[PDB]
């Protein structure tokens, strides 16, 4: 009966991994969307 439960456990592990990846995705996106107001002070403000 736990043969099908193995699939459920694998699905739960994959869902947890995907949830962690998505949670870090917002931070990764904000790492570039934000703080560029500082990097533009060197990329173009130097000009």
């Amino acid at each position: 009966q736990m043969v099908r439960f193995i699939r459920q456990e694998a699905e739960e592990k994959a869902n947890e991994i995907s949830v962690s990846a998505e949670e870090e995705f917002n931070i990764e996106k904000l790492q570039l969307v934000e703080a560029e107001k500082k990097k533009i002070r060197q990329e173009y403000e130097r000009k």
């Binding site: 009966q1 736990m2 043969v3 439960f5 193995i6």
Partner: protein
């Protein structure tokens, strides 16, 4: 084997009917004494001090001969496959015991130098020591082979405390429990019989633990793959075969070295003939004694004959 059994009598102290009768036509024929000898003097002999030094070193020479004899009689025979070298195969100085003891031809240039034997005796002793060292090397090789023998094959034949992978069934583990229903697919039966297998499954540890060690008698773990056990058994068989071959082929070389040691002992007896001649007669080597392995009655008769030079 047999220790030294040579008689002591110079040329001037022959115990036979005549001085030259020691070799043949002696009264020993009537008593069936196997005594026989043949002269083989060296080129020259040392002085009185040299004779005394040789007599002193004769004790060490006899000790070395005894050590070689003990090694040859023990290492070869104990292997139960090296004692196949008979008297002819182990002939001393190229002649069997019938002829080796009847002559001193071993005094040729092989072990000694066919020269004043004061240092030639030491040289022959060193050669015999080298031969004994080779025999000891062969014995050590035989011991290492026996260490290779009694290998992993000495363990149990599977489904037991040791080497149980040979009887493995190859979520499950090698249990072989010698004298279950749950969510897990416990409806199974492994091939772990050399023993018995029980219903178990890795999906839920309840059935697996119950079958393995939970109740009754705990099972014995073993390697999962029987290929490793088969390889270990094959290696053990190969090591046993190699040990047997060494006891039959390398120990055949050991038996050849034992025959060489017998030749060295014949040379030592030839030297001891001249040593006794110097001790109880003049310096030049000349002896009329004999070397054999007679019975008690024959030795007593020889002593009665030679009582003119008793100790």
């Amino acid at each position: 084997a047999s220790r030294y059994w040579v008689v002591s009598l110079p040329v001037q102290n022959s115990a036979a009917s005549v001085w030259n009768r020691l070799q043949e036509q002696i009264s020993k024929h009537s008593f069936d004494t196997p005594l026989y000898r043949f002269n083989i003097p060296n080129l020259r002999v040392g002085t009185l001090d040299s004779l005394l030094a040789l007599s002193d070193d004769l004790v060490k020479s006899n000790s070395f001969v005894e050590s070689v004899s003990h090694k040859i009689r023990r290492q070869i025979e104990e292997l139960e496959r090296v004692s196949g070298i008979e008297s002819s195969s182990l002939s001393v100085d190229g002649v069997p015991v019938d002829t080796y003891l009847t002559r001193f031809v071993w005094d040729e240039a092989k072990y000694p130098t066919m020269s004043p034997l004061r240092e030639i005796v030491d040289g022959i002793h060193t050669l015999v020591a080298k031969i004994e060292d080779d025999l000891k090397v062969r014995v050590a090789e035989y011991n290492n082979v026996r260490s290779q023998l009694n290998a992993i094959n000495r363990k149990q034949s599977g489904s037991l405390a040791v080497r149980d992978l040979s009887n493995l069934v190859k979520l499950v583990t090698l249990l072989a429990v010698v004298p279950t229903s749950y969510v897990v697919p416990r409806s199974s039966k492994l091939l772990y019989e050399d023993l018995y297998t029980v219903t178990l499954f890795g999906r839920v540890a309840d059935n697996f633990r119950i079958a393995a060690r939970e109740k009754g008698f705990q099972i014995r773990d073993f390697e999962y793959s029987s290929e490793a056990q088969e390889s270990r058994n094959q290696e053990l068989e190969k090591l046993v075969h190699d040990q047997e071959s060494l006891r039959s082929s390398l120990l055949q070389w050991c038996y050849t070295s034992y025959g060489e040691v017998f030749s060295s002992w014949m040379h030592f007896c030839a030297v001891r003939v001249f040593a006794e001649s110097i001790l109880r007669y003049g310096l030049p080597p000349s002896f009329l004694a004999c070397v054999l392995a007679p019975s008690v009655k024959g030795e007593k008769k020889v002593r009665s004959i030679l009582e003119e030079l008793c100790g």
